[PDB]
Structure formats: C-alpha cells, structure tokens
Amino acid sequence: GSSGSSGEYKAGDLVFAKMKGYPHWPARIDELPEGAVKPPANKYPIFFFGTHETAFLGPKDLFPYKEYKDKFGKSNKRKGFNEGLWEIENSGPSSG
Structure with a gap:
C-alpha cells in the first residue's frame, strides 16, 4: 500500500493504444x-x-487497461484484434 498516483506506466502493466484510425488496440507495457x-x-x-x-x-495517447477494460476491450474484429483481446486478458494477473 503505497501512496502516490504514479500515473507513468511500467513494464507488465496493460493499456489501450490508439493509433490514428485504428481502434483502442489491446497493448501491453513491455520493457x-x-x-x-x-x-x-x-x-x-x-x-x-x-x-x-x-x-x-x-x-497521453494511452489508457490504463483496468479503467477501460470493459469500455474499449470489446470485440472490434479488425483481424488480429480478437487474438489480442484474448492475449491481453490471458497476459495479465487473472484468477489470482
């Protein structure tokens, strides 16, 4: 339990990434x-x-996954996109 908004993303977090005319794409912070x-x-x-x-x-071009997970994390079907929407759910801390 660690005070600080710390709004500056870190490896292993998950986000939506908006490229110009693509959807809010499922993406990860890597290292x-x-x-x-x-x-x-x-x-x-x-x-x-x-x-x-x-x-x-x-x-600023990016959005925290857990705040937008249900808002943006939805079946946009762009090719790749259904894979990546599965890949991101199953990438993150889930069931634990």
Whole structure:
C-alpha cells in the first residue's frame, strides 16, 4: 500500500493504444532489452497484442487497461484484434 498516483506506466502493466484510425488496440507495457532502440523520454515500448507490432507512444495517447477494460476491450474484429483481446486478458494477473 503505497501512496502516490504514479500515473507513468511500467513494464507488465496493460493499456489501450490508439493509433490514428485504428481502434483502442489491446497493448501491453513491455520493457527494453539490453541493446535495442532508445525511445524518447516519457514514451514506452508498447507491444500491440494479436499483431505483435511494436511502436513508441507517450502516456497521453494511452489508457490504463483496468479503467477501460470493459469500455474499449470489446470485440472490434479488425483481424488480429480478437487474438489480442484474448492475449491481453490471458497476459495479465487473472484468477489470482
């Protein structure tokens, strides 16, 4: 139990990622390997589930999964999207 809003996302959290004209895509906060691209400060390695794509977004383009899980986490059927909506549910702490 740890006071602080701490609205700045961390690896292993889950989010919705909105690209320009795509849905609120199911995505995860990942971490960075010991040798890949350096993003700009504030941004995160967002991994887009069901398409497995990688882009850099900052927190304003992004939404906390548990706040939008039922709002945005719904069957948008874009191809990949039903996979990623399964992948994200089954990625996160569930049943425990």
